[PDB]
Each structure stands twice: as structure tokens, then as C-alpha cells.
Amino acid sequence: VSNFLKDFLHKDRDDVNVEIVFLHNISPNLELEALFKRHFTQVEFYQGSVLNPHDLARVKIESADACLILANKYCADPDAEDASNIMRVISIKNYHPKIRIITQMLQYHNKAHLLNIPS
Amino acid sequence: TLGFFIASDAKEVKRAFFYCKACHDDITDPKRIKKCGCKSNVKKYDSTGMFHWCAPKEIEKVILTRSEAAMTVLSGHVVVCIFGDVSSALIGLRNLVMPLRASNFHYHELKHIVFVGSIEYLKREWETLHNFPKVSILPGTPLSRADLRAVNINLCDMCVILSANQNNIDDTSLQDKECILASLNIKSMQFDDTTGVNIPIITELVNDTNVQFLDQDDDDDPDTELYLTQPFACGTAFAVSVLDSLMSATYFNDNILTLIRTLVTGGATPELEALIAEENALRGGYSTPQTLANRDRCRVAQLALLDGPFADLGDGGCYGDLFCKALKTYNMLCFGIYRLRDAHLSTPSQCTKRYVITNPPYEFELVPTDLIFCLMQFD
Amino acid sequence: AMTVLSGHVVVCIFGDVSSALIGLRNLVMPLRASNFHYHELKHIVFVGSIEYLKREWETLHNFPKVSILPGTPLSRADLRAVNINLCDMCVILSANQNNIDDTSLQDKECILASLNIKS
């Protein structure tokens, strides 16, 4: 979260009316609570998955300009995480198809599954 | 005799206690039925004669490589996409192959099961499947599109996707991740004499909020009910919550489970349970006239109206007329109509997905492009 | 099944490679205690996993008549071809002693194997 927030909320970014809303099942740790309490009108956290339609509605995904999916770089299996991110893409594109999704893929071979998704 | 039937009300099931032909002969409605009114020693089948049996062979005799399967055209067959490891738990594919080879089909009628998955999983399980007449193993990955390419997935009969890696403690909505992904991998494939959206697949899913990821071209509702969604109603998506739904029906009637278990396993006699119970191996037997009389059960099949003898009743035919003619002539219980999705529309479409209609009435019409379920007897 | 061996003791063991040793030396030694004649001795036939008994047999390999039937005590065919009905006594032992939770459920494959024998 820190690197993305720093580049997105960089002062040189000047005037951008974009509010980053984070949806994650795990509750934020104290360092995350400090980092979220460094940005008030700019960053909101919500607890929930993107594999539940109600949580997507709560984060207002349909009205959201874009959804960015971040993959843990370090994981026991790269393919498993990649398939989880592809699952999240499938859930969001099944909720609201007319959306931009920028995602991270740990493996180059796993990228083809996104092309297989129709939306 | 206790009769099992598909009703829609308790007043239906009440009026099979009482039925007087001398009182209820002339009839037009359910209001006519009132309470009162009157006062070559070749090993072929198993020991029970209930399943097709083979010689216990070696696993290398049923193994095949990719190009070896490419040498063998084997259309009209079933493939099973399995996702197993050494560490992952067994499913039991014996419960898949046995009702699919239930001695109720002829030996040319049997479908050739080709498993696709890790051989390190199938070696552990194959010691219960090694008595069956035609089964192949393609050691690979269902995500590997080359393996599905050299198994003739486009002109198979049905693909089956199973979730063996059932070990997730966290994030259980993400548990069946390599099932819907493998199904989408199958559905987005092209071929040369088409696009493989017409491939009959059934994928085991574990979550009700997860089943609408499979077939989407039309947004129904993000919170659609499980029975109302498209992939469930088309039959291309077997949820596993059906089993926990079975326990309530087993609580209210003790015979739903018995009916379904005899319908689905294809013969579940307790002598078979006892013979499996002592060695966990479907041993073979000789053929007697008592043995061949045991395979007199009826099977489950579909019927194309267009090429069928009922083709004349195919266009605009009343469902009741079709049911009566079939039961009287071929002794086939007309069982439900498997109607195409865009059939009620007027615009000719390319959607080959069909949905399920169970027990239709007399006023229900009939287009010729249907695949009505039936219970064919054994000639 | 070729060898009728009635009047004997079978021991149903439930052992793995990972499971802890019991010590069956403390079973065989008082059962062959030089106080019986050599025709009076009972023929111990172990029934269980051979991967468990190979680890333990290096303390039982000095005894005059002992057999191993590699299998499972739950396997009724193995008990059928050991002459369980005209034996002298069956012994069911719990080797898989590793349960931390639900200790009332710990000896689950002992009473179940005994009921399998009795029916």
C-alpha cells in the first residue's frame, strides 16, 4: 500500500479528485492504521472481500473509476496467488463489466487466463 | 406397493390412498376425486451382474502420452479434469465410474473415461478403478490447453471438472479457484473442422455465491438465487450445497434418499454393499440366467424430438400426448423437457445452452428442438 | 490362507512411519517367558502396516514363532485370512497416540475395529 499511496498522492500529482478506497478481508495492523490516518479525505479502508457482491456494492465498485488489484510479491506458490487475482478480476467484471481493471500478475504464463475471461 | 411420484401439493399425494374406478371413472379435474364413494467362459460382469467388469490390468496399460492420445481419435467420450496432488485428499472416482458403467448399457454404448490430471494423484486412487473395461489416463494439467487439445475436447461427450484440492481454511469463497478458471479456459478455445463455447462441461463448485462466474453473457443480478441463475439451471454447474439440502428432505421423508440412491448409483443392492464391505474391490463373477436378469433396470437418457419417432409430435405436440405414446410403445417414462434457452424468442440465435423443465402440464407446448428426459428400458 | 494356524494370538496394530513406537517387546517377552513348553507357545501374528513394524522388529527378532501380516485391521479380508474366528485372542492396540484436541475421540480406530471384528 505505501508505494502506491506515495506515487498516487505525490504532491507533484497536483489536482486529482480520486479517493482510494481499500477493500481487504484482513483488518489493518497498527502501521496500516497510522498510514490510513495520514490521509483523511483521501483514503478510506473497508473490511470485506471482492468475492462477495454486497462488499462490491458497499465500495461502490460500479461507480468506481477503476479497480487496482495488488498481488503479494512474496507467497508460497506464485500460481495460486495469480489464480486468486484472476478470481477477483472475474468477480468484479461479473458485477460490472464496463470497468477498467489494472492488476498484478506474479507469473507471465498466468496472464493468459485474463484474456480467456470474456469481459 | 409404495409409489414415488413428483407432485406439487399435498392434496395430490392424499388422493392416491383413495381412488375408486367405479366412482372416479369420468373425470375432468382434481375435484372429481373425493374421499368416499365406495367400500465362452469370458469374464464380463461382476459377481452381482450389476456392473461391467474387466480384468485387473496394469496402470501402464491404460496410461497414454499426449501424442499417443493424438494418434487415437476417441470421440463421444467423457473426460474428467482432476486437480490432485500427493498430499491432497482422495475423492473416490469409483463413485463416478461405477454408475457410468452400470451394466445397463451395451459394451459399444459405454463411454470412454479419460482422466486428465496428475498421475501422482491417480496412482493412489486407481487401485479401486482397475476393474473397468475402458478407461484412460492422460497425465498432465487441465490448465494445460495442449492436453485438452490432444484429448479431442471439442468432439467429446462431456467434460467434468472436479475440485480435489479441498484444504482451504481461509477465504472459502476463493476455494474452487482452479475450477471456474479451468472451465473458462475450456470455453475460450477455438478449433478447426469452431469456438468451444458449445462444449458440454460440468464443474463442481463449493459456493453458492460463486456459481455465476461460469456462464455470463447476460447480467441477471449480482445477488441471484442459486436456482435462478443460468449455469445452475442449464445443468453446467453442480453446486455441492445440494447435498446439505438433501438432509432436510431426508428428515421429512425417509425415502427421498433411497429413491435418489437407487436412481443415481444405478443399482445399490445391500448384497453389493456387503461384497464391497469385505474387500473394497468389485470382484468379478460368471454369467448365469439369474445374473443377466439382474441387469433389467432402466437407465437415464435424452431423446431428440427431430430425428425421433415422436418427431411428428415434435412440432406443437402436447407434452401429455408424447408421454402417453412413449410409455405405451417404448415403455419410456417421459421425465422432463430439456428446452433450449432462446427457443421462445423469434430471432434465430447461436446459443446452444439449454435449461431444464421438470414435469410439464398438458397446455405446455413443444418445439422440435428439445431433448426431453426419459427412462429407457433395456432391450 | 494356506497356513491353518489356530490357537494363536493376533495383534491389530495401527502404526505409521510418523507415529510413535510402543514397544511390542514388552508384549512378546511375557508371552514367551520360558515357562511354557515349545509346543505350548502361542503364535503371534501381527496385523498392521509393515512400515511401522520394520521400525520396531529389530527388538522382536529373537523370538521363536512370530508372523507379520502386512495390512489393515479394518480390512476384513486380512482378518478373514488370519483365522480370527478360531484364534485364541485378538489384541487391538492404539499406536497413533498424537491427538491434542478431542481426546474422547482419540481411540477412534480401536472400538471401531473391535466392532468390525464382532460383526
Short mmCIF file of all heavy atoms in Angstrom, two decimals, chain B residues 309-347:
data_model
loop_
_atom_site.label_atom_id
_atom_site.label_comp_id
_atom_site.label_asym_id
_atom_site.label_seq_id
_atom_site.Cartn_x
_atom_site.Cartn_y
_atom_site.Cartn_z
N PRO B 309 -39.16 -41.00 -33.41
CA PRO B 309 -40.46 -41.43 -33.95
C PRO B 309 -41.51 -40.39 -33.52
O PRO B 309 -42.54 -40.31 -34.16
CB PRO B 309 -40.72 -42.76 -33.24
CG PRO B 309 -39.88 -42.69 -31.99
CD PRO B 309 -38.64 -41.93 -32.41
N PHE B 310 -41.22 -39.64 -32.46
CA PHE B 310 -42.17 -38.63 -31.92
C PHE B 310 -41.95 -37.30 -32.64
O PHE B 310 -42.51 -36.28 -32.20
CB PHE B 310 -41.98 -38.50 -30.41
CG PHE B 310 -40.57 -38.75 -29.94
CD1 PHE B 310 -39.60 -37.78 -30.05
CD2 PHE B 310 -40.22 -39.98 -29.40
CE1 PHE B 310 -38.30 -38.01 -29.62
CE2 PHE B 310 -38.92 -40.21 -28.97
CZ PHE B 310 -37.97 -39.23 -29.08
N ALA B 311 -41.16 -37.31 -33.72
CA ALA B 311 -40.87 -36.07 -34.49
C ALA B 311 -42.19 -35.47 -35.00
O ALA B 311 -42.31 -34.24 -34.99
CB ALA B 311 -39.96 -36.41 -35.64
N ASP B 312 -43.14 -36.32 -35.40
CA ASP B 312 -44.46 -35.82 -35.86
C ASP B 312 -45.09 -35.04 -34.70
O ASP B 312 -45.66 -33.96 -34.96
CB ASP B 312 -45.36 -36.99 -36.28
CG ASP B 312 -45.43 -38.10 -35.25
OD1 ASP B 312 -44.71 -38.01 -34.24
OD2 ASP B 312 -46.20 -39.06 -35.47
N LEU B 313 -44.94 -35.53 -33.47
CA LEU B 313 -45.44 -34.80 -32.28
C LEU B 313 -44.40 -33.75 -31.90
O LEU B 313 -44.65 -32.99 -30.95
CB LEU B 313 -45.64 -35.80 -31.14
CG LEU B 313 -46.51 -35.31 -29.98
CD1 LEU B 313 -47.80 -34.69 -30.50
CD2 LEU B 313 -46.81 -36.44 -29.02
N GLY B 314 -43.28 -33.72 -32.62
CA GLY B 314 -42.19 -32.76 -32.33
C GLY B 314 -42.64 -31.32 -32.46
O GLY B 314 -42.20 -30.49 -31.65
N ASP B 315 -43.48 -31.01 -33.45
CA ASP B 315 -43.85 -29.58 -33.63
C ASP B 315 -45.22 -29.32 -33.01
O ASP B 315 -46.22 -29.85 -33.54
CB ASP B 315 -43.79 -29.17 -35.11
CG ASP B 315 -42.43 -29.44 -35.74
OD1 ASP B 315 -41.89 -30.54 -35.52
OD2 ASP B 315 -41.94 -28.55 -36.46
N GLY B 316 -45.27 -28.55 -31.92
CA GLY B 316 -46.56 -28.17 -31.31
C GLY B 316 -47.21 -29.31 -30.54
O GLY B 316 -48.35 -29.12 -30.07
N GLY B 317 -46.51 -30.43 -30.38
CA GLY B 317 -47.10 -31.60 -29.72
C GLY B 317 -47.38 -31.35 -28.25
O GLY B 317 -46.51 -30.76 -27.58
N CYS B 318 -48.53 -31.79 -27.75
CA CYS B 318 -48.80 -31.66 -26.29
C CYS B 318 -47.85 -32.59 -25.55
O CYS B 318 -47.66 -33.74 -26.01
CB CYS B 318 -50.24 -32.06 -25.98
SG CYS B 318 -51.46 -31.27 -27.06
N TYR B 319 -47.31 -32.14 -24.42
CA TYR B 319 -46.35 -32.97 -23.65
C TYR B 319 -47.05 -34.25 -23.22
O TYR B 319 -46.42 -35.32 -23.25
CB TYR B 319 -45.86 -32.23 -22.40
CG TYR B 319 -45.10 -33.11 -21.45
CD1 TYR B 319 -43.79 -33.48 -21.71
CD2 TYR B 319 -45.69 -33.60 -20.30
CE1 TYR B 319 -43.08 -34.30 -20.84
CE2 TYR B 319 -45.00 -34.42 -19.42
CZ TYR B 319 -43.69 -34.77 -19.69
OH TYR B 319 -43.00 -35.58 -18.83
N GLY B 320 -48.33 -34.14 -22.84
CA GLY B 320 -49.07 -35.32 -22.36
C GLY B 320 -49.16 -36.39 -23.43
O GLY B 320 -48.92 -37.57 -23.09
N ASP B 321 -49.42 -35.99 -24.67
CA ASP B 321 -49.53 -36.98 -25.78
C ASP B 321 -48.18 -37.68 -25.92
O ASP B 321 -48.17 -38.93 -25.99
CB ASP B 321 -49.88 -36.28 -27.09
CG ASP B 321 -50.98 -35.25 -26.95
OD1 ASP B 321 -51.51 -35.11 -25.83
OD2 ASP B 321 -51.30 -34.59 -27.96
N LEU B 322 -47.08 -36.92 -25.87
CA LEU B 322 -45.73 -37.51 -26.05
C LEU B 322 -45.47 -38.50 -24.92
O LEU B 322 -44.98 -39.61 -25.20
CB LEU B 322 -44.70 -36.38 -26.01
CG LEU B 322 -43.25 -36.84 -25.91
CD1 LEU B 322 -42.98 -38.01 -26.84
CD2 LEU B 322 -42.30 -35.69 -26.22
N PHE B 323 -45.84 -38.12 -23.69
CA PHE B 323 -45.57 -39.01 -22.53
C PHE B 323 -46.37 -40.30 -22.72
O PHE B 323 -45.77 -41.39 -22.63
CB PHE B 323 -46.04 -38.31 -21.25
CG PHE B 323 -46.11 -39.19 -20.03
CD1 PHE B 323 -45.03 -39.32 -19.18
CD2 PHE B 323 -47.27 -39.89 -19.73
CE1 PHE B 323 -45.10 -40.13 -18.06
CE2 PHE B 323 -47.34 -40.70 -18.61
CZ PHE B 323 -46.25 -40.82 -17.77
N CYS B 324 -47.65 -40.17 -23.08
CA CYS B 324 -48.50 -41.38 -23.18
C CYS B 324 -47.96 -42.28 -24.28
O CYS B 324 -47.75 -43.48 -24.00
CB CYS B 324 -49.93 -40.98 -23.51
SG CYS B 324 -50.66 -39.85 -22.30
N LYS B 325 -47.62 -41.71 -25.43
CA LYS B 325 -47.19 -42.56 -26.56
C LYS B 325 -45.91 -43.30 -26.15
O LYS B 325 -45.84 -44.52 -26.40
CB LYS B 325 -46.93 -41.70 -27.80
CG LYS B 325 -48.15 -40.97 -28.35
CD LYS B 325 -49.39 -41.83 -28.39
CE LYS B 325 -49.98 -42.07 -27.01
NZ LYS B 325 -51.08 -43.06 -27.05
N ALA B 326 -44.97 -42.59 -25.52
CA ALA B 326 -43.68 -43.23 -25.18
C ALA B 326 -43.92 -44.34 -24.17
O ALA B 326 -43.45 -45.47 -24.41
CB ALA B 326 -42.74 -42.19 -24.63
N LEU B 327 -44.71 -44.07 -23.13
CA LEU B 327 -44.88 -45.09 -22.07
C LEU B 327 -45.55 -46.32 -22.68
O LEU B 327 -45.09 -47.44 -22.41
CB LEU B 327 -45.75 -44.49 -20.96
CG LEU B 327 -46.14 -45.46 -19.84
CD1 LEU B 327 -44.92 -46.22 -19.34
CD2 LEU B 327 -46.83 -44.73 -18.71
N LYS B 328 -46.57 -46.10 -23.50
CA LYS B 328 -47.31 -47.23 -24.13
C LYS B 328 -46.44 -47.99 -25.13
O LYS B 328 -46.48 -49.23 -25.10
CB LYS B 328 -48.58 -46.71 -24.81
CG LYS B 328 -49.47 -47.78 -25.44
CD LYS B 328 -50.74 -47.24 -26.06
CE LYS B 328 -51.59 -48.31 -26.70
NZ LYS B 328 -52.83 -47.74 -27.30
N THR B 329 -45.66 -47.29 -25.96
CA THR B 329 -44.94 -48.01 -27.05
C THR B 329 -43.55 -48.50 -26.63
O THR B 329 -43.30 -49.71 -26.78
CB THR B 329 -44.78 -47.11 -28.28
OG1 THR B 329 -46.05 -46.55 -28.59
CG2 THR B 329 -44.23 -47.86 -29.48
N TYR B 330 -42.70 -47.61 -26.13
CA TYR B 330 -41.31 -47.99 -25.79
C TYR B 330 -41.14 -48.17 -24.28
O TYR B 330 -40.02 -48.47 -23.84
CB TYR B 330 -40.33 -46.97 -26.37
CG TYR B 330 -40.59 -46.64 -27.82
CD1 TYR B 330 -41.41 -45.58 -28.18
CD2 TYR B 330 -40.01 -47.39 -28.83
CE1 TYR B 330 -41.65 -45.27 -29.50
CE2 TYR B 330 -40.25 -47.09 -30.17
CZ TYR B 330 -41.07 -46.03 -30.50
OH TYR B 330 -41.31 -45.74 -31.82
N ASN B 331 -42.23 -48.00 -23.52
CA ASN B 331 -42.16 -48.11 -22.04
C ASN B 331 -41.10 -47.14 -21.51
O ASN B 331 -40.35 -47.53 -20.60
CB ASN B 331 -41.90 -49.55 -21.59
CG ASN B 331 -43.08 -50.47 -21.81
OD1 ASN B 331 -44.19 -50.17 -21.37
ND2 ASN B 331 -42.85 -51.59 -22.47
N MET B 332 -41.04 -45.93 -22.06
CA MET B 332 -40.09 -44.91 -21.55
C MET B 332 -40.89 -43.86 -20.77
O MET B 332 -41.79 -43.24 -21.37
CB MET B 332 -39.37 -44.20 -22.70
CG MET B 332 -38.60 -45.14 -23.60
SD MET B 332 -37.84 -44.26 -24.98
CE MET B 332 -37.14 -45.62 -25.91
N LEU B 333 -40.56 -43.66 -19.50
CA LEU B 333 -41.26 -42.64 -18.68
C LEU B 333 -40.77 -41.26 -19.12
O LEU B 333 -39.60 -40.95 -18.84
CB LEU B 333 -40.95 -42.88 -17.20
CG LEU B 333 -41.72 -42.00 -16.22
CD1 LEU B 333 -43.19 -42.36 -16.21
CD2 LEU B 333 -41.13 -42.11 -14.82
N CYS B 334 -41.62 -40.49 -19.80
CA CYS B 334 -41.21 -39.13 -20.12
C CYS B 334 -41.06 -38.33 -18.83
O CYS B 334 -41.97 -38.30 -18.00
CB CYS B 334 -42.21 -38.45 -21.05
SG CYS B 334 -42.32 -39.17 -22.69
N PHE B 335 -39.92 -37.70 -18.68
CA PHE B 335 -39.38 -37.37 -17.38
C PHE B 335 -39.20 -35.88 -17.17
O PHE B 335 -39.17 -35.43 -16.02
CB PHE B 335 -38.06 -38.12 -17.21
CG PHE B 335 -37.46 -38.01 -15.86
CD1 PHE B 335 -38.13 -38.49 -14.76
CD2 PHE B 335 -36.18 -37.51 -15.71
CE1 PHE B 335 -37.56 -38.42 -13.51
CE2 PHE B 335 -35.60 -37.45 -14.47
CZ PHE B 335 -36.30 -37.89 -13.36
N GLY B 336 -39.11 -35.10 -18.24
CA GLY B 336 -38.91 -33.67 -18.16
C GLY B 336 -38.28 -33.18 -19.44
O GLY B 336 -37.54 -33.92 -20.08
N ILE B 337 -38.55 -31.93 -19.81
CA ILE B 337 -38.13 -31.41 -21.10
C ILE B 337 -36.92 -30.52 -20.91
O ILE B 337 -36.94 -29.60 -20.08
CB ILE B 337 -39.28 -30.64 -21.78
CG1 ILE B 337 -40.43 -31.60 -22.06
CG2 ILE B 337 -38.81 -30.01 -23.07
CD1 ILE B 337 -41.69 -30.91 -22.49
N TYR B 338 -35.85 -30.79 -21.66
CA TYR B 338 -34.61 -30.04 -21.57
C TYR B 338 -34.59 -29.04 -22.73
O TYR B 338 -34.00 -29.26 -23.78
CB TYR B 338 -33.42 -31.00 -21.59
CG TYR B 338 -32.07 -30.35 -21.45
CD1 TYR B 338 -31.76 -29.63 -20.32
CD2 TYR B 338 -31.08 -30.54 -22.40
CE1 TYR B 338 -30.53 -29.05 -20.16
CE2 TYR B 338 -29.84 -29.98 -22.25
CZ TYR B 338 -29.57 -29.23 -21.13
OH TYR B 338 -28.34 -28.64 -20.96
N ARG B 339 -35.26 -27.91 -22.49
CA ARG B 339 -35.59 -26.95 -23.54
C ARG B 339 -34.46 -25.95 -23.74
O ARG B 339 -33.82 -25.52 -22.78
CB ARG B 339 -36.89 -26.23 -23.18
CG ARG B 339 -37.40 -25.22 -24.19
CD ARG B 339 -38.76 -24.71 -23.78
NE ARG B 339 -39.76 -25.77 -23.89
CZ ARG B 339 -40.42 -26.05 -25.00
NH1 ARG B 339 -40.20 -25.33 -26.09
NH2 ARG B 339 -41.31 -27.03 -25.04
N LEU B 340 -34.24 -25.58 -24.99
CA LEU B 340 -33.22 -24.60 -25.35
C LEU B 340 -33.61 -23.22 -24.82
O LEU B 340 -34.79 -22.90 -24.66
CB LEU B 340 -33.04 -24.59 -26.87
CG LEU B 340 -31.85 -23.91 -27.52
CD1 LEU B 340 -31.44 -24.71 -28.74
CD2 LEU B 340 -32.20 -22.50 -27.94
N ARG B 341 -32.59 -22.40 -24.54
CA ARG B 341 -32.81 -21.15 -23.83
C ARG B 341 -33.50 -20.13 -24.73
O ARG B 341 -34.54 -19.56 -24.37
CB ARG B 341 -31.48 -20.61 -23.30
CG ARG B 341 -31.56 -19.53 -22.21
CD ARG B 341 -31.54 -18.11 -22.77
NE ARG B 341 -30.40 -17.88 -23.65
CZ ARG B 341 -29.19 -17.52 -23.23
NH1 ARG B 341 -28.97 -17.34 -21.94
NH2 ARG B 341 -28.22 -17.35 -24.11
N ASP B 342 -32.93 -19.87 -25.90
CA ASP B 342 -33.52 -18.91 -26.84
C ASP B 342 -34.45 -19.59 -27.83
O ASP B 342 -34.36 -19.39 -29.04
CB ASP B 342 -32.42 -18.15 -27.56
CG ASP B 342 -31.70 -17.18 -26.65
OD1 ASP B 342 -32.33 -16.68 -25.69
OD2 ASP B 342 -30.50 -16.92 -26.88
N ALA B 343 -35.38 -20.40 -27.32
CA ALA B 343 -36.36 -21.04 -28.17
C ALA B 343 -37.66 -20.27 -28.20
O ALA B 343 -38.33 -20.21 -29.24
CB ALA B 343 -36.61 -22.47 -27.70
N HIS B 344 -38.03 -19.65 -27.08
CA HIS B 344 -39.23 -18.83 -27.02
C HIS B 344 -39.08 -17.53 -27.79
O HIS B 344 -40.08 -16.91 -28.14
CB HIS B 344 -39.59 -18.53 -25.57
CG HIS B 344 -38.58 -17.66 -24.89
ND1 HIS B 344 -37.40 -18.14 -24.39
CD2 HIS B 344 -38.58 -16.33 -24.64
CE1 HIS B 344 -36.71 -17.15 -23.85
NE2 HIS B 344 -37.40 -16.04 -23.99
N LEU B 345 -37.85 -17.11 -28.06
CA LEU B 345 -37.63 -15.93 -28.87
C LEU B 345 -37.92 -16.24 -30.34
O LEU B 345 -38.04 -17.40 -30.75
CB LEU B 345 -36.20 -15.42 -28.72
CG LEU B 345 -35.83 -14.87 -27.35
CD1 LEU B 345 -34.37 -14.48 -27.33
CD2 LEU B 345 -36.71 -13.68 -27.01
N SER B 346 -38.02 -15.18 -31.13
CA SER B 346 -38.23 -15.31 -32.57
C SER B 346 -36.95 -15.20 -33.37
O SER B 346 -36.84 -15.82 -34.43
CB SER B 346 -39.22 -14.25 -33.05
OG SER B 346 -38.66 -12.96 -32.91
N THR B 347 -35.98 -14.43 -32.89
CA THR B 347 -34.74 -14.26 -33.62
C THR B 347 -33.89 -15.52 -33.52
O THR B 347 -33.67 -16.02 -32.41
CB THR B 347 -33.96 -13.06 -33.08
OG1 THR B 347 -33.59 -13.32 -31.72
CG2 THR B 347 -34.82 -11.81 -33.13
#
